[PDB]
């Protein structure tokens, strides 16, 4: 409902699940998105250890600043991506929701700071920006506040409308990954010499019903010569035997 400010963006950890990107169009299909170092088509089956999602609201003209290598009021003091970022940047218009009459001052952005922020850095300091050579004290001449309010109005142009931007991040480590992409799964034919793939086990043969009694923790059986002769359906949990196709 309410997104965080651009100078105080929050980071959400995503793990132990399948990253389905089709539900994003359900909540608004105006998700203008650009990817860097990866493609959304090839991302449908990749695996990652941890997934991080950032959220912030900016104006229309500031959307182009959320990209590796950009420079601006947001890219230097609010939020910045590394030069070798791997992921996708998604943004959409939010004028009909985040704008209110007489100006919406609930969102703030940093405009003055002694140094630029690093990629993936968050800073919520509100110290007075000292512009003069004399020591700063209180508020007055040569004293400027580092944060400024947007003031979104519904009658503003498209360049000034509020835009909600969500950036997805991916991380891989030497730990067993828990996030992967959506899979496929088809039907089940019998009494025919066809190729099969049961959860990574590939082969060829004829599939028929058998009378084996597998334990609840059993998946596949082997004979004396250590060859696969029986497997189970991951969606039916029935016992099926495997027989080689005819040859001679």
């Amino acid at each position: 409902t309410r997104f965080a400010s651009v100078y105080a963006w929050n980071r959400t950890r995503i793990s132990n699940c399948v990253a389905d990107y089709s539900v994003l169009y359900n909540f608004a299909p105006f998700f203008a998105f650009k990817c860097y170092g990866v493609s959304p088509t090839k991302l449908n089956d990749l695996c990652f250890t941890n997934v991080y999602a950032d959220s912030f609201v900016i104006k229309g003209n500031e959307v182009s600043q959320i990209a590796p290598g950009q420079t601006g009021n947001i890219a230097d003091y609010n939020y910045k991506l590394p030069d070798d970022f791997t992921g996708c940047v998604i943004a959409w218009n939010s004028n009909k929701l985040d704008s209110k009459h007489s100006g919406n001052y609930d969102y703030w952005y940093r405009s003055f700071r002694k140094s630029k922020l690093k990629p993936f850095e968050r800073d919520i300091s509100t110290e007075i920006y000292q512009a003069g050579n004399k020591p700063c004290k209180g508020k007055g001449p040569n004293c400027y506040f580092p944060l400024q309010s947007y003031g979104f109005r519904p009658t503003y142009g498209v360049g000034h409308q509020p835009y909600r931007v969500v950036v997805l991040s991916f991380e891989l480590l030497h730990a067993p990954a828990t996030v992967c992409g959506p899979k496929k799964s088809t039907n089940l034919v019998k009494n025919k010499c066809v190729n099969f793939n049961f959860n990574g086990l590939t082969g060829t043969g004829v599939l028929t019903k058998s009378n084996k009694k597998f334990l609840p923790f059993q998946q596949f059986g082997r004979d004396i010569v250590d060859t696969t002769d029986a497997v189970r359906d991951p969606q039916t949990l029935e016992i099926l035997d495997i027989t080689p196709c005819s040859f001679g």
Binding site: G103, A131, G132, P141, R153, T155, Y156, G157, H160
Partner: protein
């Protein structure tokens, strides 16, 4: 840190609140002019007070950034625009008196009325009736009576107020290191700090006088022709070698001679060019007019309009349920908000005014990229010139025939061209000597070259010498007839109109040369010419960040005002007048007067 960085940070802090309060004030003024209610009036007054307080609190603080230590031109211009003192340099009592005199003169001008001597209960206002008598009446007695009564009722009450106003303006100018208020006005044309583009206030007067002397032959021929025609239009009332009366010029003050076209038409048998009937037959409306204007502005290469422009602009008459000002005005609100307030009807005049306002909005969108303090044209007449060039391009018969208004069997003849040129001269060339005379008189009054006991005398002398207009009654110093005008009583300059009249012809010639036009200048159509529009936009996008001389040279190739465009435009009309005036005297005599008998 340095002073330049401090000034840049101050401007960055300023521009946000500046644009915010400017958008607020613009929205309040739009709600006022679109819906006249007590709430809207109160909101507009509150927004104006807030904007005044903001301009006051931003002042006296930018003074801590000396211009001598600023190297950036944009920052220096912004600081110079913020370090303006205005009328606040004088005492509070003098400023209050000046404001009270201004408000009283504006109220007297707005409440001007003329009552019938035979019935005191019946009274006629300036715009509804007086100007209509001057436009559509031929009775000499009624016109003389109105011309006398209006001045005797208005000018006699504005003389001491105008005197004190001039005194206070001269004091304010001397407080700001200026010689006089006319010098303060001319200071807007002054340019310094640019190699090869500097401009001085005396050079402006010299160029204006040179252009006046160059137009003097054509204006004398036009005046001789108008006098020869009025000799038949007004028998025994127009002298063959004398000046023309002030009440027979087509209006109350003699500003435009457009109303004299019906009496000075060269060939009355030729039909007038008017697409109003064609637009009514095609069932056009304000929406269609604005869509055709947008199509033209896209064909010439200018950007399109935004959705908020079409959603917020009141292009139709709101009716009696919502009182609004139907005067066509251009509005710039900022943050991508651009609106047009105009009750456009199905006519050709509204068709040209739509293109005028669209050119204004295009200039606004062009200089919107500049900082808020620079979101203005290089001069006061630049916007009006950019509008008028597009209006004239749309008014050409070629454009009206291409869009499907004029019949494809339309044939052109020399008589129609001569009539059109004479009408354009009466609408444009006729006001230039009057404007020059009025501006020079105001400048001499501000400087003090005319003693107070000879103001009206020198006014009538300059009238007879420049405009060829003699007054029917020798009004003494108790009258203040010059202050009976809107621009004179509301503290507005008139040289802006002369500069715009020159710049529009210069820009027209430049765009027609860029579009590779061949033949007459009045037959030039910039439609479907993206090069000329792009060249114009390249200058419109600069705003006031560059001197007006550089912006003028980037378009027409000249750093100063040029009179050659007007001569090249009116060359056929000039030759026709030279051929027709072979049987009449050229010029006018200042010795003749209607009261000499």
């Amino acid at each position: 840190s340095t002073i330049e960085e401090q000034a840049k940070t101050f401007l960055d802090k300023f521009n946000h609140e500046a644009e915010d309060l400017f958008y607020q004030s613009s929205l309040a003024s739009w709600n006022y002019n679109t819906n006249i209610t007590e709430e809207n009036v109160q909101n507009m007054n509150n927004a104006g007070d807030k904007w005044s307080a903001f301009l006051k609190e931003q002042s006296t603080l930018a003074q801590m950034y000396p211009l001598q230590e600023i190297q950036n031109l944009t920052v220096k211009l912004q600081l110079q625009a913020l370090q303006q003192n205005g009328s606040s340099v004088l005492s509070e009592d003098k400023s209050k008196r000046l404001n009270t005199i201004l408000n009283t003169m504006s109220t007297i001008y707005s409440t001007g009325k003329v009552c019938n001597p035979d019935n005191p209960q019946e009274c006629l206002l300036l715009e509804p009736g007086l100007n209509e008598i001057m436009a559509n009446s031929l009775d000499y007695n009624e016109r003389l009576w109105a011309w006398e009564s209006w001045r005797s009722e208005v000018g006699k009450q504005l003389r001491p107020l105008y005197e004190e106003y001039v005194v206070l303006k001269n004091e304010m100018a001397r407080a700001n290191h200026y010689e006089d208020y006319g010098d303060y006005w001319r200071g807007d044309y002054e340019v310094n700090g640019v190699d090869g583009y500097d401009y001085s206030r005396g050079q402006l007067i010299e160029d204006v006088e040179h252009t006046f002397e160059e137009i003097k032959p054509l204006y004398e021929h036009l005046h001789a022709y108008v006098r020869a025609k009025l000799m038949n239009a007004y028998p025994s009332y127009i002298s063959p070698i004398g000046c023309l009366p002030a009440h027979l010029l087509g209006d109350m003050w003699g500003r435009f001679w457009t109303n004299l076209y019906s009496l000075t038409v060269p060939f009355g048998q030729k039909p007038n060019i008017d697409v109003t009937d064609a637009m009514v037959d095609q069932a056009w409306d304000a929406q269609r007019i604005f869509k055709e204007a947008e199509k033209f502005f896209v064909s010439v290469g200018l950007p399109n309009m935004t959705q908020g422009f079409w959603e917020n602009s009141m292009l139709t008459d709101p009716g009696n349920v919502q009182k609004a000002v139907c005067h066509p005005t251009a509005w710039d609100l900022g943050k991508g908000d651009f609106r047009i307030l105009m009750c456009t009807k199905v006519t050709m005049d509204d068709f040209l005014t739509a293109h005028h306002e669209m050119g204004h909005i295009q200039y606004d969108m062009a200089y919107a990229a500049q900082p808020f303090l620079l979101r203005n044209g290089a001069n006061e007449g630049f916007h009006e010139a950019v509008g008028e060039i597009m209006s004239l391009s749309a008014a050409t018969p070629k454009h009206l025939k291409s869009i499907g208004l004029l019949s494809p069997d339309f044939q052109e003849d020399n008589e129609t061209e001569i009539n059109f040129l004479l009408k354009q001269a009466l609408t444009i060339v006729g006001t230039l000597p009057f404007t020059y005379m009025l501006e020079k008189w105001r400048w001499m009054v501000f400087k003090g070259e005319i003693p107070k006991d000879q103001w009206m005398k020198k006014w009538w002398e300059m009238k007879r010498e420049i405009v060829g207009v003699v007054e029917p009654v020798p009004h003494d110093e108790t009258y203040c007839d010059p202050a009976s005008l809107f621009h004179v009583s509301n503290d507005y300059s008139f040289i802006r109109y002369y500069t715009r009249t020159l710049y529009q012809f210069q820009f027209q010639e430049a765009l027609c040369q860029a579009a590779k036009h061949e033949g007459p200048l009045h037959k030039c159509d910039i439609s479907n010419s993206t090069e000329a529009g792009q060249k114009l936009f390249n200058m419109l996008r600069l705003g006031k960040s560059e001197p007006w001389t550089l912006a003028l040279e980037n378009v027409v190739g000249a750093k100063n005002m040029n009179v050659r465009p007007l001569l090249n435009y009116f060359e056929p009309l000039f030759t026709w007048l030279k051929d027709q005036n072979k049987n009449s005297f050229v010029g006018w005599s200042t010795d003749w007067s209607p009261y000499a008998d």
